[PDB]
Protein: L-rhamnose isomerase
Amino acid sequence: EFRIAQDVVARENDRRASALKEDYEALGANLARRGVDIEAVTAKVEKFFVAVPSWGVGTGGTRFARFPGTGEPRGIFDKLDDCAVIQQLTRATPNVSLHIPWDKADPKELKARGDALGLGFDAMNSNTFSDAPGQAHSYKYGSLSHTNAATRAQAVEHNLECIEIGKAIGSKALTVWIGDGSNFPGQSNFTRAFERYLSAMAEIYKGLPDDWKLFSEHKMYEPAFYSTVVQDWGTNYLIAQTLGPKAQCLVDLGHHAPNTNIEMIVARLIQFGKLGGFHFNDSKYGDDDLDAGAIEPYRLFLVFNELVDAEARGVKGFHPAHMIDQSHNVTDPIESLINSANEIRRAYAQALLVDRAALSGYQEDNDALMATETLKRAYRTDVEPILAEARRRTGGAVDPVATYRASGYRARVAAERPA
Amino acid sequence: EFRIAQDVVARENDRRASALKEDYEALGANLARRGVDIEAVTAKVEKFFVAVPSWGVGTGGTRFARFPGTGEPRGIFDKLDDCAVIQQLTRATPNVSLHIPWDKADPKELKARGDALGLGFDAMNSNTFSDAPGQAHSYKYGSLSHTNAATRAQAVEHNLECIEIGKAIGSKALTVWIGDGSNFPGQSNFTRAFERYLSAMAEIYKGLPDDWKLFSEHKMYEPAFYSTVVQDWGTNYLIAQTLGPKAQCLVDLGHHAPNTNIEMIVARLIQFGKLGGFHFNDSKYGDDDLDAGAIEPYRLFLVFNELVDAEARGVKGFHPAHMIDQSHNVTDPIESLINSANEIRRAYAQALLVDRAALSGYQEDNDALMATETLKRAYRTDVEPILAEARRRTGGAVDPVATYRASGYRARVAAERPASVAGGGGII
Amino acid sequence: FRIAQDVVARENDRRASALKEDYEALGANLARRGVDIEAVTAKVEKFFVAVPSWGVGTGGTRFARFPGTGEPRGIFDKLDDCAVIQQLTRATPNVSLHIPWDKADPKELKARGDALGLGFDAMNSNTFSDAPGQAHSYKYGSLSHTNAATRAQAVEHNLECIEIGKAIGSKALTVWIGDGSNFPGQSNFTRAFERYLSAMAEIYKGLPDDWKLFSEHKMYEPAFYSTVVQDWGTNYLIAQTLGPKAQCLVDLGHHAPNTNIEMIVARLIQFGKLGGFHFNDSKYGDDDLDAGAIEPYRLFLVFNELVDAEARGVKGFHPAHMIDQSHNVTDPIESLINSANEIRRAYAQALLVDRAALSGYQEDNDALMATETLKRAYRTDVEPILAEARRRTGGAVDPVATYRASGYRARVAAERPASVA
Amino acid sequence: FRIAQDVVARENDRRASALKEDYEALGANLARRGVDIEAVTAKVEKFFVAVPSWGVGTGGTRFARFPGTGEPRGIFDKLDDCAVIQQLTRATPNVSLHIPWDKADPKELKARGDALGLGFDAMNSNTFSDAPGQAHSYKYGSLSHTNAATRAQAVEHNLECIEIGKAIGSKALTVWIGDGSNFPGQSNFTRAFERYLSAMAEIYKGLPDDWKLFSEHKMYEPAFYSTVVQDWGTNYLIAQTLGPKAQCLVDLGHHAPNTNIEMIVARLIQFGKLGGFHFNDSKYGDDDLDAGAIEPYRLFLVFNELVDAEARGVKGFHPAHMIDQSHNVTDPIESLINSANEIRRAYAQALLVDRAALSGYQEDNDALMATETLKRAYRTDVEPILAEARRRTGGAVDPVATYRASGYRARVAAERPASVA
Ligand SMILES: C[C@H](O)[C@H](O)[C@@H](O)[C@@H](O)C=O
Ligand SMILES: C[C@H](O)[C@H](O)[C@@H](O)[C@@H](O)C=O
Ligand SMILES: C[C@H](O)[C@H](O)[C@@H](O)[C@@H](O)C=O
Ligand SMILES: C[C@H](O)[C@H](O)[C@@H](O)[C@@H](O)C=O
Ligand SMILES: [Zn+2]
Ligand SMILES: [Zn+2]
Ligand SMILES: [Zn+2]
Ligand SMILES: [Zn+2]
Ligand SMILES: [Zn+2]
Ligand SMILES: [Zn+2]
Ligand SMILES: [Zn+2]
Ligand SMILES: [Zn+2]
Structure:
C-alpha cells in the first residue's frame, strides 16, 4: 500500500522530469570527462540505505519545552505509518529503528504492519536512562553500572527483553546507550563504575544470539555533566574488545568533544574491526541532534570518505549499520528525516567520486595541496541529479519534500489524530 | 516561623562549637600574622547575600528524563517554605527570585508568606520560552523576536504583567531570558530578528518604574542550536546600551563558549556600567547548571576577585543583583542550594583576603609570578571557619547540611506532599 | 610578466573545451533557476581580496619551520611572488604590508608595485615582537604596557606605519597585538584596556581623513590566560570609543570553539563597525589554514551575511577583505592561489541565494525550506564561473596547474639563496 | 651548592616561627579529622617529579620569544639551573634530557649530574624539527613519514637516544612527534598509523629489559587537521600493540576542550598502561602554563585518581611524572619551583581524602557528601606541610623568596652573555 497517492508522485515527478534529464545528462558528460561512469554511481546510491529512528518521527523537544506540530503520532503504529512515507519518497530508509519501552507493542503486529508498509527493522534500542511505569528500581543514579546489584540486574533483564522483541520482528542487533555517569567529582569511582558496567554488559552479551551484534554508544556528556562511564571511543573500544567478536562500537556524530576529528575515530575503529555503525545527525555546540549535513556538510563527506576508503584498501567483513538519530524540534519530522536521508546519500555519492588512484599518489608524494583538492573535486560536485534519478528509478520522488507537501499528508493525519 | 526547630540548630551547633572555636582562633592568628583582622572579614561575609531561584528547590531534569525525589514542592508556596530552610540555616539567601507563570499567585499572599517566613523578593523572571495552557500564540519560533507581530505583543504584555506582580511584592527588577534563535542556517535573518527583539524590549522598558532595572541574559546556545539572538555579552552590551540607563546585563556562568574568560567579561561590563548581576552555578561541558564551585572553584574565586576589586575601589553605583540559577537532578535540591550559597560566600571571603596593595605593585612591576601567587595566597586560605562562625552569629547552623539532615525536614515534607512520578524529558 | 603568457595561453587552451561545456551546462541550470550566469560572473570577476606579504614565505610553529625552495629574501621578492598570484587568479590586485618586516623606501615599494600591477591594502603594525635597537621590550605588552614610555614607543611605531602607507597608497592601518596575561592576577583587566584605549586614541589622531583604523580581536595566543582585545565585544567597545574611522576586523580563526562567527559579522554590520576580514580556515585554534579547506560551509555562511547586507541596502558598506594565513606544508604561492579561489567560490555561491524565496521562508518560519534555500546555492559547483572570470581577465583556467607548468618555483629557487644562519 | 647554605638557613629561620605555628595548628585540625600530619609529610617529602632540561630557558610562541637575563645556553648551564630547583624544593632530583638539544659526552653529563645531586629521568627524542646536515626532513612526518628512509632515520635517532640514556642512568624513552596533516586527504589516517606502529616496533626492539617506551598523544599542534597519535584511545592502541614495556604518557594540556582528563588517567591505570603524567596547566589549548595556576582543582582531581591507585598499588602502576611547561613571561626557575610546589600540594591534599567515607557515599549514591568529602581535603591548606617537608630535607621554607634573596638570577646574568645588551 502507499501512504502517498501514486498519482501525486507521478504528477510531481513528471513536472520535474525535463529538468532532471537535463541536469543528469550534463553531470553524466562531466563525470565521463573525469573518467567516471555516472550509471555506476547511481547504481550504488540507490543501494545505500539508512535506518530511521522511531523516536524522531514525532516532534522533539528540550528540557525547556516541547512545541508539538499537528498530526503528532499517537504511538509506534502511527510512527510506522509516517516512516512509510519517508521510505516511499526517498527509497533510502527501508528499515526503522525501534526503541523499547517507548515502542512496546505486540511484536507480531509490529512485524505485520512493517511488512504491509514495506518496512524492515534495524537494531533494537534499549532504554535504561529513564524510568518506566511500575519499574522496581530507579535509574536515577545509573543502570548497568548502578551501585545496587538489583538495579543492574533489572537493567540487564530489560536489555534481554529488547532482544526477544527484536528476534520476533527480524532485528539483528541491540544498541546500548545509557546516561550512566556523575554530576559531581567524587560521586562515582570511575574504575569501579566501569567494572560494574563491563560485568553487566557481559551478561547481556551472554544472552546475545549468535547472529546478532551488540553496539555500545559513547557520549561525552548529557545527561551526566561531570563524568560519563562510556564517555569516548577509547572507553568504547575497551568495551567492545573486552566483550567479544559480536560487540562493536557505534559512533554518533554529535557525541564528541569540541573540535574532535571524528573521521579519524572512524578510521581507527575500522582498522581494529570495531566500527559497528553510525548514528547520523549534525551539530554545532553539543549533542544538538540536528538534520544531518545541515551544519557541517564537509565533515559528513569526510566521514564517508573513510568509509569508501576502507573498501578501496580492501578491508573485509566491513558492513556498518547506518542509522539516523535526530531530534526535530522546529520542523515537520518527516520532511527533516527525508532531507537528512538525502544528505547522507549525497555525502556517500560524493565520496564515491573521489579519484582514489590520484589521491593515493598525492599522499605518497606528500603533495598536501593536490591531495586536499582531490577530495574537493569530489565534494564540490553537485550530485543532486544522481540522487533524484536514483529515487525516480526506484519508485521515489524527484523532489521528496515537494511531493510530500503536494500530497497534503500532514493535514491528513492532523485530521485523523488528536491535538 | 521556623521551618527548622531551633532546638535542633542549637543542638547541632553546640556539638561542633568546640572544634569551630579552635579553627576560627587558629585562622584568626594566621590572618593576624598576615596583617588581616579576621573579624573584619567575618563582618562582611555575614552581610553577603545571593538570591535563590524558586524553580531551583524542586528536582530538575534533562530532555531524557526527570527523577523526582520525595516531598517535591507542589507550587510557589511549598517552594517558599523550602527556601526559608535555606535562609534559616545559611543566612545567605534572604531573597527569592520568582518565575511567572510558574509562581503566579495572589501578590498579597506571596508577600504575606514571605514576611512570615522572613524572605524578601528579588528580580522577577518572565517566561516566553514555553507555552502555557490557553495561550493564543505559540513561542515555538520565538517570542520577543518572533516574526509575527501579535506574538511579540503577547510576549511584551506578559513581561509587563511580571513587572506588575513584582511591584506588588517588593521586587525591583525584571530578568529576561528567552530561547529565541534558530536551529538551521537561513531559518532566521540575524539582524532583523535582533531588530525585532530590540523594539519589543524597548516596549517593556517603557513599563519600568524609575527605581527598577531590566536585565537581559545572554546564552550561546540551548534551546536554539544554530544561532541565538542574545548569544553573548557583546550582543548583551548592545542591548543594554540601546535600551537605556535602567537596562543592564546578567552574566550566567555556564552560558559561555568553551574556554571563555568569564571574569574578563565581568570586568568589562563593570567598566562600562552594565553589570546588572550574576547567575551563579558551575559547569564542565555546557550550561550544566551544576552546584556553584563544584567543578571549578578557582574560576568562581577569580570572578569574585573582580567583584571585590570594584567593591573596594569605591566604584559607586555598583550593586550587582546576585542569584543562583541551578538545576538539581541527582541531589536533594535544598542541600545543594545550601552548599552552593556556601561556596559563593567562600569565594567572596577568599577574594576579601587578597592583598590589593601587594597585587597592584606586582601588576605595575609585571611580576606575573608574584601577582598570581598573591591571588593564590588568598584562594588557598581555608575560610570555612569564617563562614561557619558567620552563620552561627546570625542564627544559622555551623554545618548547614548536617543540621538539615538531623532535622528530618525532607522526611517531613515528604509526608505532607503528594508523591511524584519519574518520567522522560521533552525529547519525545 | 612573472609567468610567461604563452604558458597561460597553452594551459587555458588545453582546458577550453571542458570549461565551455561545464560553464554552458551551469548556465542553463542557473537560467532554469531564474539566475543569469553572466551577471554572477561579472560580479565575481570584480571581487578582490588582499594577499598578506607575510604569507608568501613558508610559515612555521613554535616547534619548527620547514622552509621550501626559493623562499623570498625580502619584501621585493615577496611582491614578485604576489604578482604571480594576481596574474593567475586575477583576484588579488593588492598586498598587505607588515612593518618592520617589509620596511624599505616607500618610493621603491610603490614603483615595484606599479611595475607588477599590484596595489597596497591596509598597513599592519608589529608590536608583538622586539626589533633591534628598541628602547623598550614588548615582552609584557605594547599599547597596553604598564610603562608609559613603552606605550609611547608603540604609538610612534604605528604612526610610522601610517606614514609609510600614505606614501604607497594604503588607506588603513590594522592593529593586532599580543597584549594580555598568562596568569590570573598578572594584569588588571580594566586598567590594561584603559591604557590600550588611550594609546589607540593617539594613533587615531594621526589618521588622514580618508583612512580607517582596524582593531583585530583574538581569544588567545600569544597570551594564554587573558588577552586585552579578546573578542568582538571588546572590539566593538574600542571602535565605538575611538570614533567614525575606527572599525573591527574579524579574523575567522580567532574565536572560541563553536562560536557562531557569521552572527558576529552580522552584528558588527548592523552597528556599522565591520571594518574587514582576515580569511583563513581552522579546526582547533588560530590554525591559519587555507580558507575553505576545513569548513567551506562556514565560509559560505559568512558571505551570506555580507551579501544580505548589500541586499538590505546597508549604506557605505565596503569591508576590507584580506587573507591572513600561514603555509607550513605547501608551496605558499599555490595555497594563496587556491585560498583566493575558495573565497571567490563562497562569494559566488552567496550571490546565487534566492533572497526572494528566503525572505518568504524566514517570515513564515519555514526553517527547513529556508536552510534548503541556502543549500541550493552552496551545493552549486561555481568552479566554471570562477574559471571563466579568470579567462576573461587574463588569468588561468586552472591557476595551480598553470603555475606548476611554468616551473616558477624551480626558477626562483635557483635565483634565491637559502638563509644559512 | 648553587645557592649559598647561609642564605637558605637565614631565610628559613626568618620564617621558622610562623611555620611552627601553622604546622602545629594544621596538625591539630588534621588530628580532629583522624589524620596524622606526620604520615602525610613523610610521603610528601618523598614525592618527586622530573624537571625538563628545556624548561629552565625562557620559552616562546610562533610570534616571538622574549629572553630574560642569564639565559642558560647548553645542557651544562641548564643542569646548573635545574640544580637550584632541586636544592630549594627537594622535589625535582631528576632531569629529563632532550636529544639533540642536550647532546654531549655521556660521561661528562653523568659527571655533572652526580656533581649537582641530579639524576636523569626519561630520554626525549626529537623528530619534530630538522637538525643541520640532516639527510631527510621531518616536514611531512618522521616515524610515520611515507618515505621509508625517513622513517629509518627517525628510528635510528630514537635508538641513539636509548644508547645515550643507558650511559647516564635513564630507564625510559619518551616519544612525542608532530606527525599528522594540516589538510583533509593529505594523509591516509590508517596507513599513516600503520607506518607509525611499524616504526615504533623497531624502537621497542632496542629496549633493555628494564626500560619503558612512552608514547604521548596530542590533539593538535604542530598538525592542525589530524595528528597520528591524537588522543588516549590511539595511545592505548599503541601501548597494547607494542608490548608490556610500552605505556602511555598523559600531558594535561593535550586534550580537547572540556575533556575529563582524570577519567582518562583512571582508565589507563585500570588497564596497566599509564606510563606517566606530564604536568602543566592550560585554559585554551596546549598553553604549557605553570601547573595549577589556572585550574588547581582539576590538578587535585587527577591526583585523587593517582593517590587512590598508589594506596592500593595497582598492577603496573609506577608512573614516571615530569613537568612539561613553557615559561614565556616569568623567571623559568621560579615558575618550575612553584609548579613543583603545586604538584606536591595537589598530592598532599589528595592524601587527605577520607577514602573510607568517600567509598561509603559512593555506594549509597550520596553525591553531595561524596563531592564534599573530596572538597574537605582540597580546601585544606597544606602549605605548612609542603614547607616543613622542604625544611626537613634541606630545602627552603619559601623557595621563591629564598631564590630571590640569593641573587642567583643576577649571578648567572653576569656569567652568561645575553644575546644583546
Ligand atoms: C534515543 C536514543 O537512544 C538516544 O538518542 C541515544 O542514541 C543517544 O544519541 C543519546 O544521546
Ligand atoms: C528559568 C530561567 O529563566 C533560566 O534558567 C534562565 O535564567 C537561563 O539560565 C536559561 O538557560
Ligand atoms: C601577522 C599578523 O599581524 C597576525 O597574523 C595577526 O593579524 C593575527 O592574525 C595574529 O594571530
Ligand atoms: C619538547 C617535548 O618533546 C614536547 O614539549 C612534547 O613533550 C609535548 O609537550 C609537545 O607539545
Ligand atoms: Zn545516538
Ligand atoms: Zn545523542
Ligand atoms: Zn540564568
Ligand atoms: Zn542556563
Ligand atoms: Zn589576522
Ligand atoms: Zn591569527
Ligand atoms: Zn608532554
Ligand atoms: Zn605540551
Remarks:
- Residues D 54, 98, 124, 176, 216, 218, 251, 286, 324 surround L-rhamnose (ligand 4) (CB under 6 Å).
- The longest strand of chain C covers residues 246-251.
- Chain C touches chain A at residues 18, 21-22, 25, 28-29, 32, 257-258, 260, 283-284, 290, 293-298, 329-331, 334-335, 338, 365, 367-369, 371-372, 378-381, 383, 400 (CB under 8 Å).
- The domain at 1-421 of chain C is CATH 3.20.20.150 (TIM Barrel).
